[PDB]
Design a protein around this motif. Structure first.
Motif, PDB file in Angstrom:
ATOM      1  N   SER E 226       0.826  -1.199   0.000  1.00 20.35           N
ATOM      2  CA  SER E 226       0.000   0.000   0.000  1.00 20.35           C
ATOM      3  C   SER E 226       0.862   1.251   0.000  1.00 20.35           C
ATOM      4  O   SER E 226       0.548   2.229  -0.683  1.00 20.35           O
ATOM      5  N   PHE E 227       1.969   1.259   0.835  1.00 15.12           N
ATOM      6  CA  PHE E 227       2.874   2.399   0.896  1.00 15.12           C
ATOM      7  C   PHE E 227       3.660   2.546  -0.397  1.00 15.12           C
ATOM      8  O   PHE E 227       4.046   3.659  -0.765  1.00 15.12           O
ATOM      9  N   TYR E 277     -10.212  -1.525   3.283  1.00 13.74           N
ATOM     10  CA  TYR E 277      -9.018  -0.716   3.067  1.00 13.74           C
ATOM     11  C   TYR E 277      -8.280  -1.164   1.813  1.00 13.74           C
ATOM     12  O   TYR E 277      -7.814  -0.339   1.019  1.00 13.74           O
ATOM     13  N   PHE E 280     -10.125   0.062  -1.250  1.00 18.03           N
ATOM     14  CA  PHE E 280      -9.905   1.491  -1.423  1.00 18.03           C
ATOM     15  C   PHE E 280      -8.539   1.743  -2.050  1.00 18.03           C
ATOM     16  O   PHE E 280      -8.405   2.534  -2.999  1.00 18.03           O
ATOM     17  N   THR E 281      -7.522   1.033  -1.566  1.00 14.69           N
ATOM     18  CA  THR E 281      -6.187   1.163  -2.136  1.00 14.69           C
ATOM     19  C   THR E 281      -6.158   0.709  -3.589  1.00 14.69           C
ATOM     20  O   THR E 281      -5.480   1.320  -4.417  1.00 14.69           O
ATOM     21  N   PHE E 284      -7.556   3.384  -5.798  1.00 13.74           N
ATOM     22  CA  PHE E 284      -6.610   4.475  -6.009  1.00 13.74           C
ATOM     23  C   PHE E 284      -5.431   4.048  -6.876  1.00 13.74           C
ATOM     24  O   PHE E 284      -4.872   4.870  -7.604  1.00 13.74           O
ATOM     25  N   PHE E 376      -1.674  12.440  -3.033  1.00 14.53           N
ATOM     26  CA  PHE E 376      -1.601  11.139  -2.382  1.00 14.53           C
ATOM     27  C   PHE E 376      -0.970  11.251  -1.002  1.00 14.53           C
ATOM     28  O   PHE E 376      -1.364  10.537  -0.077  1.00 14.53           O
ATOM     29  N   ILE E 379      -3.703  12.428   1.285  1.00 12.05           N
ATOM     30  CA  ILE E 379      -4.559  11.305   1.663  1.00 12.05           C
ATOM     31  C   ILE E 379      -3.865  10.444   2.709  1.00 12.05           C
ATOM     32  O   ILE E 379      -4.486   9.990   3.674  1.00 12.05           O
ATOM     33  N   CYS E 380      -2.571  10.189   2.522  1.00 15.60           N
ATOM     34  CA  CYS E 380      -1.807   9.422   3.499  1.00 15.60           C
ATOM     35  C   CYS E 380      -1.904  10.051   4.883  1.00 15.60           C
ATOM     36  O   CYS E 380      -2.210   9.377   5.872  1.00 15.60           O
ATOM     37  N   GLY E 383      -5.589   9.920   6.338  1.00 11.15           N
ATOM     38  CA  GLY E 383      -5.928   8.580   6.773  1.00 11.15           C
ATOM     39  C   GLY E 383      -5.185   8.161   8.019  1.00 11.15           C
ATOM     40  O   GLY E 383      -5.784   7.586   8.933  1.00 11.15           O
ATOM     41  N   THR E 384      -3.884   8.453   8.093  1.00  9.80           N
ATOM     42  CA  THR E 384      -3.136   8.107   9.293  1.00  9.80           C
ATOM     43  C   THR E 384      -3.708   8.813  10.512  1.00  9.80           C
ATOM     44  O   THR E 384      -3.883   8.195  11.569  1.00  9.80           O
ATOM     45  N   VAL E 387      -7.627   7.402  11.196  1.00  9.22           N
ATOM     46  CA  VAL E 387      -7.683   6.020  11.653  1.00  9.22           C
ATOM     47  C   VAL E 387      -6.779   5.801  12.860  1.00  9.22           C
ATOM     48  O   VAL E 387      -7.198   5.190  13.849  1.00  9.22           O
TER      49      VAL E 387
HETATM   50  C1  V8D Z   1      -7.806   5.569   5.669  1.00  3.39           C
HETATM   51  C2  V8D Z   1      -7.186   5.282   4.368  1.00  3.39           C
HETATM   52  O1  V8D Z   1      -5.762   5.581   4.461  1.00  3.39           O
HETATM   53  C3  V8D Z   1      -4.994   5.076   3.497  1.00  3.39           C
HETATM   54  O2  V8D Z   1      -5.432   4.445   2.571  1.00  3.39           O
HETATM   55  C4  V8D Z   1      -3.564   5.363   3.762  1.00  3.39           C
HETATM   56  C5  V8D Z   1      -2.988   6.028   4.813  1.00  3.39           C
HETATM   57  N1  V8D Z   1      -1.617   6.019   4.701  1.00  3.39           N
HETATM   58  C6  V8D Z   1      -1.360   5.357   3.594  1.00  3.39           C
HETATM   59  N2  V8D Z   1      -2.510   4.949   2.971  1.00  3.39           N
HETATM   60  C7  V8D Z   1      -2.611   4.241   1.677  1.00  3.39           C
HETATM   61  C8  V8D Z   1      -1.236   3.766   1.229  1.00  3.39           C
HETATM   62  C9  V8D Z   1      -3.227   5.135   0.614  1.00  3.39           C
HETATM   63  C10 V8D Z   1      -2.667   6.370   0.321  1.00  3.39           C
HETATM   64  C11 V8D Z   1      -3.218   7.183  -0.654  1.00  3.39           C
HETATM   65  C12 V8D Z   1      -4.337   6.775  -1.348  1.00  3.39           C
HETATM   66  C13 V8D Z   1      -4.902   5.551  -1.066  1.00  3.39           C
HETATM   67  C14 V8D Z   1      -4.351   4.734  -0.094  1.00  3.39           C
END
Ligand code: V8D
Ligand code: CHT
Lengths: 409, 426, 412, 387, 388
Positions: E226-227, E277, E280-281, E284, E376, E379-380, E383-384, E387
């Motif tokens: 995912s990273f 998750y 979703f990945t 993207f 991106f 979003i990272c 999401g971090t 969550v």
């Molecule tokens: C709550 C969702 O968070 C994530 O998907 C997330 C948080 N850190 C990393 N990711 C993943 C790699 C991601 C990044 C960008 C787009 C899609 C997915």
């Protein structure tokens, strides 16, 4: 045989096999429990279950099966089917499946003094807790707990089987060289037997047989570890390739996918317990993370190598670190460095200016490429050191794992 | 009325037959149980499970003095069938079974002759434990045994033996598994080479107990390897040779590393399948496993050396210097060893022309150096080819010839000259 | 002491377990069935077997086990182990394994009039031929066939249970004891008595009792985890028509990657359906179609690459090809003498090189035009296929009535 | 029924289920054996085992179980447990994984004249030799050998109920088709017992596989990936994707060969035609990769080190191209003067070298066109011959 | 023993095991049922079956089996085969794969007052409604329902030994943790039989999964790929390797999704958070492939055929680059000879024009790449934070 049939009819006229033999109320029955291992069939780590082919050496005394040999033409002993006499319901308490009792019901041997010997046979599936910390360089400690399911310590006393001569007790599993089959994946190191009590339950007692077995890890070495070492070599190699080759991502991604596949396949052979992480899985995760960082740093190097003044301006710190300081340390220093006639002169001058501008632009591009090359060399050395040290440390730690000289049981 | 009913009632009821007492006049006497085995089908041999599943007919024969009658007193009844749960039978058990099936599951009748000779021929599906020697897989031969012991009685009470036969008045023991040439189904994968039967005695034990004797039927079988050769070895060998062929691609192709890496990953896949198809024993590494490890290491060397070649091919005077030593080593000696082929405006104009000339000359020298580095790379990879590909072919030939020169020893029991064959009894 | 003792001792004394309890010679025993479903454990598609946790209720009349309540202190009901009584050997005929009888041999309730009430539980694995034509939007029509294993229609008369004078023609489902499966939903559950008219009233197989389960799969899991990724990945082939046609464009890389991904998805689907050959699953047809389309796209990418990288040295651009592909199709979408000689030579050579480059550019443009046309064709094909599959899948509805001919609903 | 209870008590009062049902011990019991196939559970090709759900219909006459209906209220038939009366011991000789004899002791129908009808169910897991030559369009012929184990032909004789088994109630397989089925009675002489004959009845079923699961899931992808073999030769060397495509084709083909291998037994009796086709395709693909690497190496041959020999210029540049028609192939000023002359000379030399390089590229192009034509010829002759 | 032999002969001489042990038929047998969990063998999440190793302790009084110790030498306890006396038909209602009732008929203890104690073993393969929404950090609550099959509450009464099942000798699983466990007695009133109570005891265990194993073996690789997801936007287009990286990431994520699905039941009741998750990945990553194909197309745009529109230039060359702060972006014959030199100069001028146009297109492509990289990263971060 007339006389043996007469003896049998006399013995079992009023004998009830449902009644424990106790001449006087309150007497206990001493039962000797031994075990002979004929083949250590399987040790299924996925389900934590050990399958063994064993003889269960039992022996007790029945005062009711007594006779005088002289009165029956000197018949010293009899072979009587086991369903006809009382036996203690000795079973394997820590079995995995539901099979408690024995499989093969052989005859008992009753001697004229009342001594009953019974050596049934069984294929037992005994549950064995497995420690995965050092898989596959691990030694397991699997036990088989035998006790009377029915009678407690107020009714039967468990003891250790006597040797063939009948002089001393045998405090270990017996192995008959003429009927033992070496497993080929496990070597038996210790095999003690010990009586156990519970402090809180005075009515509990069992005889437990232990099997300290050491795995022979050649299979896992050959089929999992060496391939990952080669994959790690490729991952280190990725940093020696030139960015112009156009095969850096191919190599790094291939190594990553290969190691991931190895981890996924190896996940099928380890128990799903969560108390610890096996050494093999730790090594595989370490290599996987290392190769992922290899991919990331290769992408960074490729990005650096494909920069030009038309797009990027080199900051001062990058030039200071990568052009001047590191290369001496990495041994990667680069080598030191009329109308028509008027129109024609103008054209030649334009050509000269064009060439000069092209040369300056190329010099700056070359500077960026040199930064990329120096960074790639630094990464090469760092990754080589880390990979070698990590692999050696992990497998050295794995190699210093042997079962104790004292079984503690 | 059927006289058989009267005879059986006389034998089992009037005489008070006891099926839990050995068939002997006196206690100290002994009972001889003749034994033989007929193999009707060799069902399978799972190397993963280390198990041999066999469909056999296990023959027994003893004497019961209590089942004797005068054929004249009754009608001329010369034979009789009785269920085994009415008479005494010896419980011979297969000691080395994987599952809990110690003895036949179908208890068929017993044939009793007027002289007391009792015969019993039940069928059985036995799952015995056979250790697998994977040293020469798939050109291997296995040596599986079925070990039968009598646990209900000791050697002083019943004596196991091998069934005897007559041809010309002299009894000769049957030291082999009987195979009926028409009631036998040849196995697709395994073919039987030797099938001796031996009565073992262990003098270090005593006739007191039940570990003093047994009858073991051995079964030496060879694997027919065409299946694996066609479906596993040939693709692996061809894909392996592709790697050595990867040395011949020019560095400008942009596919040297991809080719070598593809070959390595294919080798890894084949190694994983080979792992899946064998038991996890540590006695020895299988022949195919050794070949795969050797070829994978060699292809890793190929990948590393293609990487070195690429690094050499893309050097330029802007980053490296072509020293005289490397130049003479990789451009003079090795290529021959390896048999490689072969007024103010006027002044401004003049100055501009001179500058253009100087720049073009510099560019030509730069390209000359680049070409020299290209030649160095070609020399390196040619040397690599000539050093590695012969090792690859020699190793492949050696490994797959040593395995093919592996035969069963033509006589079981090394120290025994006897052939243990049906055609020449002892 | 318990009065049931002497009662049961009198009943079971002088009672043959092996004799059918027929009063006279022409009497027929009415055996009554009622099936209660408590848990639909699973439906093994590969094994083509349905596992159910049911209680089967069987009732008959045994005139031998009848007493007079006033004689035994008003005892009007006793329990007797089933191994001591005559039972109608009612078995599941369409089992996959050898298990005919019930799992647990419970006690039989016996009433003073002779009525017998037996309710053993059982775990039944029954054959259910599976139709894969609409997976994972399929609905299955599984049945449990019960018939006597011993007695024929002249001895035992199988019938459906009648409750309150109205026949019970369905599988009973108790809201107290019922766990909804989660993967399958029960839509219809009719029961009926069936006759095999090829056989006479003898032959023991003449009469049956069949309980039907029409179950509809909940498709969300398979949509999310298999179909949606498959379609999204398959839609990526059309992108190869916008990558440059030269070294480093990676047309063939992307095309072949998508082809291999589709093959892997085909294998995955294969692992999820039975190996029967009566029909091809819908998603399987889709996967085959997109594999064929992407193979065509691989060929087309190879052709475009071959066209674009042509040079005047090897292949000569004609006037027909130029006119067509660059016309209408795009529309629709001492020392001094030596110095002079050297300068002339330089100019000539430069001009020649420039002309060669121009010809190469013309070929590149032809390649781009071909790319655009083939892109539109491929997108049309892919969209048509995906829409067709979506429509066919989403329009498969479970039948309104349990039996299409009949107008009855077969519900309580 | 009181009448039936009394009758059954009278029949078995002095009945000995160990003796044969014959008036005199020299007679033999006639048993008419008939097999009824209810289902074909599976055919495990890898293990060579066929699992069937059958009923083994057996009939015979027991003179000891006869009664007069007049004395028992006119009872003509009764049902008795199989364990109360003598039964014949039929054994399936070629058992592989299951039971040798009948284990479900169901009730049997006893007539008032002594005639007995017994139809117990069974699950025969019998051995089946699998011929894989025409997989997945193969037909399997494997049998069920039934006979009396302990009684010879002069004591108990078995005869078939009909020439063929009974498939009236057979459940449609969905994976095989019953092409044919027949039952034959044999007299055999075993080495155990050479004096007297032993009878048996062998039922065999000719099974035809329905080739739709494997055609969709195995053969069609195999063919689709095989038909990519030729594309390698039409791809220009400048694209830098020849090795990628050819290697992908080869690896896909070998993966499919492995998949096919997992579906058939490991026997070496014969090789599948599909597997042999896949092996032939792999061999040709590897030859194609070899020639492709030669083509790539030629296309980048620098004129500096390599001089094209005459024997290749004459053949590849003057002979084959004309043969093939389908394609569309073919002070300061002094220094300034010296520098201009240098530039002109260098351009002339570069033009010469480029001409040589383009000649090498032309040779590579003609080579891969020749290979493409050979591939097309093989494809055409193969597709004609198969039809 | 002679005394015990006589006692056993007298006890069973006229004892019928088909009769309830009650003095009068109107009473009921009080049975004290207690479950003892020895080992939790497995939890098959795919099939939703929980295998357990239990001992089903049961106690009751049988007056017919009483004796006076003084008459038999003082014997106060004996052991009788359970096949010799009346036993309660206690059945596991929610059995899924095993046996409904007890099959191992062990001996039972019997006091001189009639008190009986029977503790047979059993393997209960019961049905477990598995709720995979926090897998592998999930909590499972599934039960074992026991009751007397053929007797109602007015004939045989069952009561639990204690509020909780006995786990004194429980064998620690190493894969689940026993958070809680209770047992409840229920009086039901079915519809068949609306006049009498039907008793039932339901034991339930709250198992908490220990997640280390699944974390290390599934989640860490999934997270790692995912990273790697957004890494393609930092890869220059001249490398000719963006499709390789993007497709590799997509296929790796697909493989890991397929690995996860084979670890949970196919039920559609709920969707695991990890799978959500992962999808979703994947969405993207598909977007990344499409947008990077667009970027590649832009980077190689031919300056001859395409002319940069003014809005594109303003957006991607004049405004956006300034926004990024952390980036390092930039923001006769002689007559012929003379004419030839002039031609050379003119052609260089035209080539320079074309190359500048091409470099402008390449700059636009890089800017698009960098915008997508920053999006991106946003979003990272979001999401971090949300969550975790
Ligand atoms: C709550 C969702 O968070 C994530 O998907 C997330 C948080 N850190 C990393 N990711 C993943 C790699 C991601 C990044 C960008 C787009 C899609 C997915
Ligand atoms: C018929 N057989 C020879 C197989 C067995 C005789 O008992």
């Amino acid at each position: 045989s007339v006389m043996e049939d007469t003896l049998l009819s006399v013995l079992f006229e009023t004998y009830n096999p449902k009644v424990r033999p106790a001449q006087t109320v309150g007497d206990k029955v001493t039962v000797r429990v031994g075990l002979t291992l004929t083949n250590l069939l399987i040790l299924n780590e996925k389900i934590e279950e050990m399958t063994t082919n064993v003889f269960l050496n039992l022996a007790w005394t029945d005062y009711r099966l007594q006779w005088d040999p002289a009165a029956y033409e000197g018949i010293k002993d009899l072979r009587i089917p086991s369903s006809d006499v009382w036996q203690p319901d000795i079973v394997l308490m820590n079995n995995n499946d539901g099979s408690f009792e024995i499989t093969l019901h052989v005859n008992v041997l009753v001697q004229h003094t009342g001594a009953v010997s019974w050596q049934p046979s069984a294929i037992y599936r005994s549950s064995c807790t497995i420690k995965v910390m050092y898989f596959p360089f691990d030694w397991q400690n699997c036990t088989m707990v035998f006790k009377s399911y029915t009678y407690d310590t107020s009714e039967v006393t468990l003891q250790h089987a006597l040797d063939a001569k009948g002089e001393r007790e045998v405090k270990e599993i017996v192995i008959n060289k003429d009927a033992f089959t070496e497993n080929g994946q496990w070597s038996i190191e210790h095999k003690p037997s010990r009586k156990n009590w519970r402090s809180d339950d005075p009515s509990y007692e069992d005889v437990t047989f232990y099997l300290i077995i050491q795995r022979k890890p050649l299979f896992y070495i050959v089929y999992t570890i060496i391939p990952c070492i080669l994959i790690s070599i490729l991952a280190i190699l990725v940093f020696y390739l030139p960015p112009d080759a156009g095969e850096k991502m191919s190599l790094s991604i291939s190594a990553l996918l290969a190691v991931t596949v190895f981890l996924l396949l190896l996940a099928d052979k380890v128990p799903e317990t969560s108390l610890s992480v096996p050494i093999i899985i730790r090594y595989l995760m370490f290599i996987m993370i290392l190769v992922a960082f290899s991919v990331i740093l290769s992408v960074v190097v490729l990005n650096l190598h494909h920069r030009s003044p038309n797009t990027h301006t080199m900051p001062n710190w990058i030039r200071q670190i990568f052009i001047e300081t590191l290369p001496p340390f990495l041994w990667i220093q680069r080598p030191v460095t009329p109308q028509d006639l008027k129109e024609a002169v103008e054209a030649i001058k334009y050509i000269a200016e064009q060439l000069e501008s092209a040369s300056e632009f190329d010099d700056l591009k070359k500077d960026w490429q040199y930064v990329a090359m120096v960074a790639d060399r630094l990464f090469l050395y760092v990754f080589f050191v880390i990979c070698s040290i990590g692999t050696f440390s992990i497998f050295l730690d794995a190699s210093h794992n042997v079962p104790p000289d004292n079984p503690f049981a | 009325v059927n006289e058989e009913e009267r005879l059986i009632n006389d034998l089992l009821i009037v005489n008070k037959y006891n099926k839990h007492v050995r068939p002997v006049k006196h206690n100290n006497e002994v009972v001889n149980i003749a034994l033989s085995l007929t193999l009707s089908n060799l069902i399978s041999l799972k190397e993963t499970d280390e198990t041999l599943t066999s469909n056999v007919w296990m023959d027994h024969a003893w004497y019961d003095h209590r089942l004797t009658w005068n054929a004249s007193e009754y009608s001329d009844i010369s034979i009789l069938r009785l269920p085994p749960e009415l008479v005494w039978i010896p419980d011979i058990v297969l000691q080395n079974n994987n599952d809990g099936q110690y003895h036949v599951a179908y208890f068929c009748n017993v044939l009793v002759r007027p002289n007391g000779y009792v015969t019993w021929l039940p069928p059985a599906i036995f799952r015995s434990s056979c250790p697998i020697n994977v040293l020469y897989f798939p050109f291997d031969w296995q040596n599986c045994s079925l070990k039968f012991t009598a646990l209900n009685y000791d050697a002083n009470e019943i004596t196991m033996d091998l069934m005897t036969d007559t041809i010309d008045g002299k009894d000769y023991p049957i030291e082999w598994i009987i195979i009926d040439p028409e009631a036998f189904t040849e196995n697709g994968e395994w073919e039987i080479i030797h099938k001796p039967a031996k009565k073992n005695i262990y003098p270090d034990k005593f006739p007191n107990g039940t570990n003093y004797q047994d009858v073991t039927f051995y079964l030496i079988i060879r694997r027919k390897p065409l299946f694996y050769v066609i479906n596993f070895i040939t693709p692996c060998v061809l894909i392996s040779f592709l790697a050595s062929l990867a040395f011949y691609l020019p560095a400008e192709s942009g596919e040297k590393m991809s080719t070598a890496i593809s070959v390595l990953l294919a080798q890894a896949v084949f190694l994983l399948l080979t792992s899946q198809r064998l038991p996890e024993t540590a006695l020895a590494v299988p022949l195919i496993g050794k070949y795969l490890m050797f070829i994978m290491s060699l292809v890793t060397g190929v990948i590393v050396n293609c990487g070195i070649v690429l690094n050499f091919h893309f050097r330029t005077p802007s980053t490296h210097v072509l020293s005289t030593r490397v130049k003479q080593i990789f451009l003079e000696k090795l290529p021959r060893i390896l048999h490689m082929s072969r007024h103010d405006e006027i002044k401004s104009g003049i100055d501009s022309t001179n500058y253009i000339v100087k720049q073009i000359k510099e560019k030509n020298a730069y390209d000359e150096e680049v070409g020299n580095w290209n030649l160095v790379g070609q020399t390196i990879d040619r040397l690599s080819m000539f050093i590695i590909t012969p090792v690859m072919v020699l190793g492949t030939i050696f490994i797959f010839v040593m395995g093919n020169f592996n035969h069963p020893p033509a006589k079981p029991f090394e120290g025994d000259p006897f052939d243990y064959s049906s055609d020449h009894p002892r | 002491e318990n009065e049931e003792g002497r009662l049961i001792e009198k009943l079971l004394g002088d009672y043959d377990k092996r004799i059918i309890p027929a009063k006279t010679l022409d009497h027929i025993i009415d055996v009554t069935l009622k099936l209660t479903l408590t848990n639909l454990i699973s439906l093994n598609e590969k094994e083509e077997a349905l596992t159910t946790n049911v209680w089967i209720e069987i009732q008959w009349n045994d005139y031998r086990l009848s007493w007079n309540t006033s004689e035994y202190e008003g005892i009007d009901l006793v329990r007797i182990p089933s191994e001591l009584l005559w039972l109608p050997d009612v078995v599941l005929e369409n089992n996959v394994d050898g298990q005919f009888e019930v799992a647990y041999y419970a006690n039989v309730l016996v009433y003073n009039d002779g009525s017998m009430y037996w309710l053993p539980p059982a775990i039944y694995r029954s054959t259910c031929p599976i139709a894969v034509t609409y997976f994972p939007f399929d609905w299955q029509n599984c049945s449990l066939v019960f018939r006597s294993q011993t007695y024929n229609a002249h001895e035992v008369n199988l019938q459906l249970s009648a409750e309150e004078g109205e026949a019970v023609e369905w599988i009973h489902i108790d809201p107290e004891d019922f766990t909804e499966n989660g993967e399958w939903t029960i839509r219809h559950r009719p029961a009926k008595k069936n006759y095999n008219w090829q056989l006479t009233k003898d032959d023991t197989d003449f009469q049956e009792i069949i309980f039907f389960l029409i179950i509809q799969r909940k498709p969300l899991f398979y949509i999310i985890n298999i179909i949606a990724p498959c379609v999204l990945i398959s839609s990526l082939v059309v992108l190869v028509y916008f990558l440059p046609a030269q070294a480093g464009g990676q047309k063939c890389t992307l095309s072949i990657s998508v082809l291999l991904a589709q093959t892997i998805f085909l294998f995955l689907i294969a692992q999820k359906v039975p190996e029967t050959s009566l029909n091809v699953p819908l998603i399987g047809k889709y996967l085959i179609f997109v594999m064929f389309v992407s193979m065509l796209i691989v060929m087309n990418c190879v052709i475009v690459l071959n066209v674009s990288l042509r040079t005047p040295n090897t292949h000569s651009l004609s006037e027909k090809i130029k006119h067509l592909f660059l016309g209408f199709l795009p529309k629709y979408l001492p020392e001094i003498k030596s110095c002079v000689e050297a300068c002339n030579f330089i100019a000539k050579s430069t001009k020649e090189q420039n002309d060669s480059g121009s010809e190469n550019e013309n070929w590149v443009l032809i390649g781009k035009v071909i790319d655009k046309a083939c892109f539109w064709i491929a997108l049309l094909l892919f969209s048509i296929g995906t829409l067709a599959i979506f429509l066919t899948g989403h329009f498969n509805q479970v039948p309104e009535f349990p039996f299409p001919g009949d107008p009855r609903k077969y519900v309580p | 029924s009181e009448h039936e209870t009394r009758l059954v008590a009278n029949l078995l009062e002095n009945y000995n289920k160990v003796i044969r049902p014959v008036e005199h011990h020299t007679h033999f019991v006639d048993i008419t054996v008939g097999l009824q196939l209810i289902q074909l559970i599976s055919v495990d090709e890898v293990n060579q085992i066929v699992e069937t759900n059958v009923r083994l219909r057996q009939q015979w006459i027991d003179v000891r179980l006869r009664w007069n209906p007049a004395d028992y209220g006119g009872i003509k038939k009764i049902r008795l447990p199989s364990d109360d009366v003598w039964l014949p011991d039929l054994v399936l000789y070629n058992n592989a994984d299951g039971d040798f004899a009948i284990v479900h002791m169901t009730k049997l129908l006893l007539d008032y004249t002594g005639k007995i009808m017994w139809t117990p169910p069974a699950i025969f897991k019998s051995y089946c030799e699998i011929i894989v030559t025409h997989f997945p369009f193969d037909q399997q012929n494997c049998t069920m050998k039934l006979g009396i184990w302990t009684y010879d032909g002069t004591k108990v004789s078995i005869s078939p109920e009909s020439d063929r088994p009974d498939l009236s109630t057979f459940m449609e397989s969905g994976e095989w088709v019953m092409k044919d089925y027949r039952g034959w009675k044999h007299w055999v002489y075993y080495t155990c017992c050479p004096d007297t004959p032993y009878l048996d009845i062998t039922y065999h079923f000719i099974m035809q596989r329905i080739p739709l699961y494997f055609v969709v899931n195995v053969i069609i992808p195999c063919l689709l990936f095989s038909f990519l073999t030729g594309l390698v030769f039409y791809l220009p060397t400048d694209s830098g994707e020849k090795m990628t495509l050819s290697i992908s084709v080869l690896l896909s083909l070998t993966v499919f060969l492995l998949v096919i291998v997992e579906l058939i037994p490991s026997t070496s009796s014969a090789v599948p035609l599909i597997g042999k086709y896949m092996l032939f395709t792999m061999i040709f693909v590897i030859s194609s990769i070899i020639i492709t690497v030669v083509v790539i190496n030629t296309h980048h041959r620098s004129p500096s080190t390599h001089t094209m020999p005459q024997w290749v210029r004459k053949i590849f540049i003057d002979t084959i191209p004309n043969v093939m028609f389908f394609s569309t192939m073919k002070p300061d000023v002094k220094s300034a003067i010296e520098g201009v002359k240098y530039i002109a000379e260098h351009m002339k030399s570069d033009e010469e070298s480029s001409n040589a390089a383009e000649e090498w590229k032309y040779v590579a192009m003609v080579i891969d066109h020749i290979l493409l034509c050979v591939f097309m010829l093989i494809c055409i002759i193969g597709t004609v011959s198969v039809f």
